[PDB]
Subunit: 443 residues, 4 copies
């Protein structure tokens, strides 16, 4: 209780609980199918938003009131944050965290310097790690903040930058393997363009592919076993980011033979910024077999930039979780809270309140989706809707016995064709009924 | 001059011309590189917007004043339109048109009936064709208007509909081959979803692929030589259309081994509705080697639906044409005016005025792009910008002599890395200078 | 049971009900504060979407399967629809309907003709009305469908059209007064522009104002007592509609002295299309004292056009209803279901299913908002948040005792200023708790 | 040449000029109607973007290479910037600049401290001012950057903040009057909301109005003669900003009796972010008689946040300038370049290149608009389009001799009504012709 003395370890208080520092729906311990609820959800904290971020926006200064802000020595701060991390996870009941290499340790004048400094904090992280139960869900290299990357990393126009980026990723892969990460994420924040006038699209996409596979070859050369995750985003900071979305990123991987090595880390706000719903992007990832992990936030659909808010909407969490359950639940991934407090929610307790809200909403949603999937209510409607492809000519079609000519013959004279209603208004009311059903079974 | 007696054949009148029924920039005959300008641009009329469409919008009745509207007998109208088509192209100087099978001939009670009726008009089209110089750029089947397709065509939930759709496409391929079309287009207008709740995404995408290849196999079985074009659109009428954009459609083709057979027909308004610029979508198509053809319109970026306006913006036409020239110009495609007059531009002369405006804008843009490409002004800046990948470690990288380890070695101690400016503000002013340059060389 | 023989009168079946033709949350009879629930909500059917509309979209033909479609004589159909209206309301338990003058009766060759034809159906409506309990919530003139209005009605460039529009509105006001309407709505569907190039903005806004007040003067001259409602919409069909939103329309009214006579009919989908949330638009209307009535639908935030879906989202209905309750509930207005079935929900039962879903969602939302308002949970937080304006200099400010000079004096030396957290993450979790609370008290 | 030794004073080099540090269209000295071109345009630099801003974006560190960055003492930097300002304006040929109070001088621990520090730099600004020809177009107080304003300034929930804000504005008004500013701008950057849950909309709007008028009363008490400008913005940083746009802000002013004292400073990117075109917002301001000044930038319509780019599009500059000319040109306002270089355009020469590009584009646009307005080409079409309101019943309507009854009489039997085409496709081609015309008359 050194850092956040006023915050106690958080416990479950049930559906009617009134205390803001209590879980209303998330019972970490509750077992479902022989697994405690915590092992279904695999909640994780994002080091960047929670410990580094201080409420600065394009028009304003940082607002956050954080304990480690007294330490003015960059290294004291870096260490203070590592300690706060573990205390935070302990009280909030979390067992996973994610970080960028540049989140944990300040940079030196050279890469060598930088790496040395980096090792210092990594070692401290490992001590507190084994003393605790928190683990590394995934690690990643920040290839977008430093001016060096203004024209991109792998897609830069400067070979020196390409080299630096390859070296940084190398280190990042190393410390991730050392800390036992389940995955390694690629967010191409500057891998895109601001204008086509100065962009050799084809060249940049080639270098990007060379980079990706150099990374997969080195992962082999060091016996790294984590899952490689690509995190799509349509834009911001760039005008167009290359991994625009699942389908686009897939197209690039498949196109260059890199797909077998990658899965996707889908973020709600990224999905909606590309004009897709969160569910859509999850389903796509799923049928491709690459639903890797999830960054659990929530954007504002009436705003054109990532708001990165804590998820407080049961409709979204339900449809999201429905996809995960149908994919078979998580393997080497989970619900990393890539979200942040509103600038005005600047008090330390708001960090806690925010994370609790997200966990409750996702927990409840998981439970609603669990019923939907168990009763099989949606799966039956769908099975009935595409019924004709099981009987008659339908099956001939699917099996491949038919061609255009045989289809013309079959259909040439048929006058009226019978069609099912879509029932959308009905299905939606159903989601409401299951929300009500589940709430009634809540403790 | 039977249909549009008040409109004379349109001729070039030069840059300072004042008459709205005159080309100011488009000189059909002007030869560039041994080809008249008309053979670079390959302008084409869209039968649907020009002859069938009458200004109806979701909130209002049709407004168009068209000659063929006296004929109340559906067939008289169908024939009246075929005649107007050729007169229109003659006066407006156009040599290509595109049509949907359901644009040219009313439907019967059965497919057989429908096909018979269809043959009647196709024959009349062929007579007037050989008597004229207009040709079929591409044909396509309307698989979205008739209620039968409310749940899609290839992605329908009813095998009967799948069959009907296969049969209709079969006929469409036939009459396209007969009329000598350069290509056959697929617009999946209803090939998408309105809700995921009733959608088996994976199944629909499978049937879609079966369909596409049945179509390519039958194209073989009839010695059809036209290019198969897929026309991407992100949405409308659907919430999500499967061929969302170039990259997405590519991903699906490549994923199912259908890519070698297809190229893309890119439409400005579709590009921008998916959150892309027209140029972006053209460049993508280009580096994939599938810049097939273009539907030349212009959307309104502040409106969320296809406005389908005539292109009157030289910046857009310049960047668009720049991509075509760099792709090597058209082969089996061209600038089909998939655009329509504003509801209030309901007079017959507005049809002409609209098409002239689009042709001028595209002609001028072609000329600006032609200079940009000739002076090689942009290509030099780009060649200089990625220079480091030719010298030193840069080339080692590209050639594949380097790995992460060797890159770490090279970069481990480098303190400062030198970067070029992006020059975006400069490049943009350049586009302005070339617009001014070209205008000064205009007759 | 003549028209919809297969549909029985709908009754309440409770929260756990499974039957799609049953209310789960809406108990018409349940009394709250001495009023049955039906008198709080005042649900109403929209004649246009339910009886006239048949599922036609810009890319497709109508799909709806409706009983009255056998009658091919326009008048038989017009009468068949009036009968269906009352049967529909009876079974679905609704007591109000809204209509456009052009929804109920086909048009003649002249206004005189048209009015005669109109009287025929109005009389039939009045008979079945007194035989039933359904009433007219509000009436309105369709000033956008007929080609005559392509350039607007009051904002047209043709004085003849202005005249026709004034005459049509006159008739509309008359039959509304005759049928006992509670209000008369103005939707300026064509009162806007598609381009500024041909628009004399100032003139059109002047004629619009002349029109509005001619209408208020004639309402006096006939002793009409209904509330005049303006229904804002940012666009569609126009590029820009003049009554863009509450604030904009207010600005125009206030600017021309017409505000005292009008209130607003707020539509969810219109609010969100203008970049506002439904709640925002309701609150604005409320503090202006002009929260007149509501068109209860739900748009799709990822689509740029009115989807006009049935409301199935409890978050929206809760925040919406919260505003109504705080405004004091309805007076001369209610929840008109200006929504329509999805094109694929083409069966008659879907009309019922759709309306039931909307009513349930709005009923439940009303109940959640009712608790929020009763416990006063939000009002207390707000009272505490702006506390400093009650004590000290705060009150001096509000009362007007202070000026800049006195404020400079008070503040010139104050070093640190204490600020409250915004608690957004907290407040949102609260809305979730009240949804859960209310569901537990549900029968 | 101390700060930017490598940049010479910029001169006009004409339409065919190739040198990026030369004006191609902007000839400062060229007289039009007895005024040099510089007095029509009144170009101005924004202190914030040019001197303070360094290319930092939400995902990245600052990139800018600026001379004054060696000075690590905050005050040395503050003074270094004032010197650079005047050198910049001299070389770039600019005679006006705009600044925020917090742009020019670092803040102290108390307001008193802060004001003292502020006076130091203001005095240095005044010396170099009288030694030069640059003037203050407008000044403004930064009421959004400092944490104190996280809940707003005038709309804050803390009376202390309200007081501080009133005091800061007081000082700002003072130094603006001292430096001879033509206007004083209000940008309510934090005057809006992020959530309605914690917002007493009515109260905040009341305090906002109290504030505005306290400001107008003190402007009187000090004999300030500059024009008060309100600068609308729909959002960012807030979810909803109160002065959403011209009409909304107008509504609030008019509603509280503050309108007679204010005019609008319209910004392109703000207009388009609210779903309006730049021209639309200018026309509105114009017919209200409050087209005060312009912030000349250009947003990216496919991005949902302010990009604040330098204007390089002649279509936009033409329609914008067309409105200014029609308003009668500038009085106490001008074209302040509230724009910034792309992050990658980090070299000092790019600052110059960017500003030159904007000035050329606006100069050329001014010239195109000047012809449009002189030939009166658009005004004639419009005069002809609304012709019927001059003759017959049309005039009776406008003059107010008509009512609904007389209009019913006039129109009751009229069968067909004749309507003009809208000619949009024609008018747009015209804008192209005038762009070509003007370019040919360019030196
Ligand atoms: Co400690
Ligand atoms: Co994100
Ligand atoms: Co993320
Ligand atoms: Co003839
Ligand atoms: Co289209
Ligand atoms: Co098209
Ligand atoms: Co009957
Ligand atoms: Co609507
Ligand atoms: Co409505
Ligand atoms: Co010096
Ligand atoms: Co701005
Ligand atoms: Co500004």
């Amino acid at each position: 209780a050194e850092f956040f003395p006023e915050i106690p370890k958080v416990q479950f208080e049930g559906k009617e609980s009134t205390n803001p520092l209590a879980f209303k729906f998330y019972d970490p311990e509750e077992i479902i199918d022989g697994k405690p609820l915590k092992d279904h959800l695999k909640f994780s904290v994002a080091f960047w938003h929670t410990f580094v971020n201080e409420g600065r926006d394009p028009f304003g200064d940082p607002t956050a009131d954080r304990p480690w802000n007294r330490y003015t020595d960059p290294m004291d701060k870096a260490f203070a944050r590592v300690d706060a991390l573990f205390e935070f996870c302990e009280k909030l009941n979390i067992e996973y965290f994610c970080f960028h290499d540049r989140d944990i340790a300040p940079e030196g004048k050279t890469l060598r310097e930088t790496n040395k400094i980096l090792d210092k904090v990594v070692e401290r992280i490992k001590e507190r790690m084994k003393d605790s139960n928190v683990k590394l869900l995934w690690g990643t290299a920040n290839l977008f903040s430093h001016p060096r990357y203004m024209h991109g990393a792998a897609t830069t126009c400067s070979a020196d930058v390409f080299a630096y980026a390859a070296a940084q990723v190398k280190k990042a892969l190393e410390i991730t393997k050392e800390l036992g990460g389940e995955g390694y994420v690629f967010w191409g924040g500057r891998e895109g363009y601001e204008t086509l006038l100065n962009t050799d699209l084809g060249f940049e996409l080639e270098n990007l592919a060379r980079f990706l596979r150099m990374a997969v070859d080195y992962a082999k050369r060091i016996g790294f076993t984590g899952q490689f995750l690509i995190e799509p985003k349509p834009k911001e900071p760039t005008k167009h980011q290359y991994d625009f979305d699942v389908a686009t990123a897939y197209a690039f991987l498949k196109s260059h033979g890199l797909d077998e090595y990658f899965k996707f880390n889908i973020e709600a706000n990224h999905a909606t910024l590309a004009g897709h719903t969160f569910q859509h992007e999850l389903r796509m990832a799923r049928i491709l077999g690459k639903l890797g992990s999830i960054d659990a936030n929530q954007g504002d659909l009436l705003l054109g930039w990532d708001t990165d808010q804590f998820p407080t909407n049961v409709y979204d969490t339900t449809l999201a979780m429905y996809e995960v359950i149908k994919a078979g639940g998580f393997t080497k991934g989970g619900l990393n809270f890539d979200a942040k407090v509103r600038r005005a929610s600047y008090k330390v307790e708001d960090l806690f309140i925010g994370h609790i809200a997200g966990m409750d909403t996702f927990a409840l949603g998981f439970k609603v989706a669990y019923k939907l999937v168990k009763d099989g209510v949606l799966d039956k409607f769908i099975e009935e809707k595409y019924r004709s492809f099981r009987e008659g000519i339908g099956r001939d079609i699917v099996e491949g016995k038919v061609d255009f000519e045989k289809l013309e013959e079959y259909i040439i004279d048929k006058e009226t064709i019978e069609l099912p209603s879509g029932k959308q208004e009905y299905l939606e009311s159903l989601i409401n009924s299951y929300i009500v059903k589940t709430i009634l079974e809540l403790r």
